[PDB]
């Protein structure tokens, strides 16, 4: 899969 | 702009609405005109700001991907010759994708970052800038490509130095800071092992913290910590 | 237009490329393109343009929907006032969709319908025309409500005619056909037992025509009217 | 679940 970056909100 | 004769309250509303319906060049375009009123924002308010543009600057990395995997495709040996529409095209989303990054990049610089006095406004808004250079390196091919580079390091620098001096090691902006530097010294740096070195320190210092938190404090730092430990996995 | 510069080969290799990058305002524009150089569509050309333009009032569609839903909401007894942004953001949502339903059936007028001959290319076009009517119908609420139902109704019972006569019951325009104007009867013309009836007679007409049908075209016609089974299944 | 309408293509 692919690198995660950030996804939070909150 | 646009936007000049709306409400502040309204836009930020619109904004909202067009999160719901899924809606994100409105609801960045709101968001630009309430940054443009020249008051500060809102915890709530940033997060507006950030949710709409990663949006469309998601799908925008995600097509320039798909049509750079295609030109280069086209650049192999034996390859047929089918002129210069891949590229043109390539470059069309590229210069859309460059000119959403110039726009972020501009409101931070006028003039979000320069009012932003508590350490949460300011970390956020410095991560901000780090992540748009960084989009802006990842197609980045000619001169400026080392100095675009360095204005992302530059920036993720400034706000992991005042993250690690004024927030806990579990805060989310924190973490999702690191998360983002981290990729970027994997992905744009060429540092595999700085970026691995930082993800597990990252990681590490928030396990050691999590004893302070709330139950719902808790879920949302272990939630950040997840992603750390799914590209360490990926890296090692 | 602005795509009046660019070459009819490049603009549907282009058309191609915003497919595969799901570019679908893109892939619309191009089409558009394609279509005001004033030659006839291919079998290929005529789905690129459907698809394009499917996708993007897709998009329009289902955002409408969402603040419809908030909309109707807030003029419930006992809602708090919120003032006038929720009516006036659907009904940006809602022009932007008329603008493009619009774009359609202009394309079709100008002049694709009077130029197709073919039962495949005019059964195309006229339910498309039928369809693009059926979205306005969707968000009508004024004097010309009846008009665009009545309009989409003529084009999509030209279509049957044509189809009945030109074409296999197995053929997946017509199956398409028949399905869209069973929903336009559930949905817009409040005649649920017309949409069952057509649904079910569809279906049956249907099977008894598979044995004629090769490997790959029995997947396509199936594969269609399995959708008119779930529609039965859900309407009895 | 939603109704269906055509999504043929082809
Ligand atoms: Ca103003
Ligand atoms: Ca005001
Ligand atoms: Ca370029
Ligand atoms: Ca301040
Ligand atoms: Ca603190
Ligand atoms: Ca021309
Ligand atoms: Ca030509
Ligand atoms: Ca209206
Ligand atoms: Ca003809
Ligand atoms: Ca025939
Ligand atoms: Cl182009
Ligand atoms: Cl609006």
């Known amino acids: 899969l692919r690198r995660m970056s950030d996804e939070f909100v909150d | 702009g646009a936007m000049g004769s709306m409400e502040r309250a309204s836009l ?10 899924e809606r994100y060049e409105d609801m960045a375009a709101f968001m630009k005109g309430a940054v443009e009123k020249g008051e500060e924002l809102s915890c709530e308010e940033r997060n507006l ?31 047929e010759e089918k002129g210069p529409e891949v590229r043109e095209y390539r470059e069309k989303v590229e210069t859309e994708l460059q000119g959403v990054c ?26 901000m800038k780090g992540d748009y250079y960084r989009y802006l390196a ?27 001096k004024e927030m806990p090691p579990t805060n989310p902006i924190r973490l999702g800071l690191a998360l983002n530097f981290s990729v970027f010294h994997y992905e744009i740096a060429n540092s595999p092992e700085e970026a691995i070195s930082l993800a597990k320190t990252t990681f590490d210092e928030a396990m050691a913290d999590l ?26």
């Open chain 2, 138 to 164: 990842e197609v980045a091919t000619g001169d400026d490509k080392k100095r675009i580079i360095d204005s992302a390091r530059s920036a993720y620098q400034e706000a992991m130095d005042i993250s690690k």
């Open chain 2, 12 to 21: 930020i509303q619109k904004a909202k609405l067009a999160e719901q319906a």
């Open chain 2, 102 to 127: 110039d726009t972020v990049l501009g409101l931070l610089d006028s003039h979000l970052i320069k009012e932003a006095g508590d350490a949460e406004s300011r970390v956020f808004y410095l991560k």
């Open chain 2, 49 to 79: 700001l950030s949710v709409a543009y990663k949006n469309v600057v998601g799908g925008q990395r995600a097509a320039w991907r798909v049509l750079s995997s295609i030109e280069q495709k086209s650049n192999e040996e034996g390859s």
């Open chain 2, 211 to 236: 004893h302070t938190l709330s139950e719902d404090s808790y879920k949302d730092s272990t939630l950040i910590m997840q992603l750390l430990r799914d590209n360490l996995t990926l890296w090692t």
